[PDB]
């Protein structure tokens, strides 16, 4: 668990299914000949972190002091680099980066970096809060992208899909989400960002039925963390 081992901490639990999905992806995306070749990881999946959207939109209790606590726990355990598999939680990214000893890597930049340069007009599937606070907007503008978001009726259904997956019914979530993906495509999306970490779990298996490339924010962050680990002269 050495710091000199370049251990990656996952500040997770938002939600727990997305965190488990990230772990599976670290295994998938890392080239390894055996157990011992995989990436060293310490994971916090401690879900009591208050709901991010309720905080931002309703003035519910802030997740910030939980994130800070669990970040220091990971650092104290030896994590040299920290990744957060929750898009909405990146509202607090800069604040956490101010207090962090460990390197931090943003899901937002990793995700935008994984969009083909030819897709200028890009759908965005995310929580109401990620949209309302514009987490992707400045970075997308800088890259010369136009973000396409579901209109109000559609967005409510996307939000319901996310929370339905969070409650554990994937089938019901899919029936809610898939029609919203087609609407984005019908409106001209050249790719669609899955900008909430439950979305890839809902979509999994249907990519073939979907006419445009889906950009997986969780997988993008995993790839970035892998590059970070692999950059070291001793790894």
Ligand X SMILES: OC[C@H]1O[C@@](CO)(O[C@H]2O[C@H](CO)[C@@H](O)[C@H](O)[C@H]2O)[C@@H](O)[C@@H]1O
Q: DSSP letter at 95? A: H
Q: What are phi and psi of 54, to 5 degrees?
A: -65, -35
Nearest to 6 by CA among 32, 41, 47: 41
191-194 and 121-125 as β-strands: parallel, antiparallel, unpaired?
A: parallel
Nearer CB in complex with Mg ion: 101/227: 227
Contacts of 29 (CB under 8 A, 6+ apart): 219, 222, 223, 226
157 near its own copies (CB under 8 A): no
- What's the length of the chain? 235
Closer residue to Mg ion in complex, CB, 94/232: 232
Single out the residue of 144, 13, 154, 172 nearest to residue 83, CA to CA. Answer: 13
Order of strands across the sheet that contains 146-148? 146-148, 121-125, 191-194, 214-216
* Residue list 106-165, contact with ligand X (CB under 6 A): 106, 109, 139
Residue 105 binding: pick among ligand X, Mg ion, its own copies, none (C-beta 5-8 Å cut-off by kind): ligand X
Site for its own copies in 31-60 (CB under 8 A): 32-51
Q: Which does 235 bind (CB under 5 to 8 A by kind): its own copies, Mg ion, ligand X, none?
A: Mg ion
Residue 199: CB minimum distance to ligand X, A: 21
Residues of each annotated binding site for succinate: 52, 86-88, 166, 197
Task: List residues binding Mg ion (CB under 5 A).
Answer: 230, 232, 235
**Chain residues that interact with ligand X, rule: CB under 6 A:** 93, 105-106, 109, 139
Residues of the shown chain interacting with its own copies in the complex, contacts defined by CB under 8 A: 1, 3-5, 7, 13-17, 19-21, 23-24, 26-28, 32-51, 69-70, 73, 76-78, 163, 166-168
């Amino acid at each position: 668990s050495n710091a000199m081992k370049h251990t990656i901490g996952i500040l997770g639990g938002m939600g727990p299914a997305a965190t488990a999905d990230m772990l599976e992806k670290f295994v998938e995306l890392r080239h390894a000949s055996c157990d011992q070749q995989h990436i060293p990881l310490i994971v916090s999946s401690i879900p009591d972190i208050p709901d991010r959207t309720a905080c931002l939109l309703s003035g519910g209790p802030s997740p910030y002091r939980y994130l800070e606590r669990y970040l220091h726990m990971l650092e104290d355990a030896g994590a040299e680099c920290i990744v957060i598999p929750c898009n909405t939680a990146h509202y607090w990214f800069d604040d956490l980066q101010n207090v962090a000893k460990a390197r931090m890597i943003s899901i937002l930049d990793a995700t935008l970096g994984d969009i083909p340069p030819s897709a200028r007009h890009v759908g965005l599937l995310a929580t109401n809060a990620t949209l309302a606070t514009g987490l992707y907007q400045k970075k997308a503008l800088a890259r010369g992208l136009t973000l396409i978001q579901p209109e109000d009726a559609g967005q409510a259904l996307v939000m319901q899909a996310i929370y339905t997956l969070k409650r554990g019914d994937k089938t019901a979530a899919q029936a809610l989400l898939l029609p919203q993906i087609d609407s984005l495509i019908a409106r001209g999306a050249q790719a669609i960002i899955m900008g909430c970490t439950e979305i890839p779990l809902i979509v999994a298996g249907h990519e073939r039925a979907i006419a445009c490339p889906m950009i997986d924010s969780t997988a993008s962050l995993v790839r970035a963390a892998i590059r970070w680990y692999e950059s070291w002269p001793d790894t």
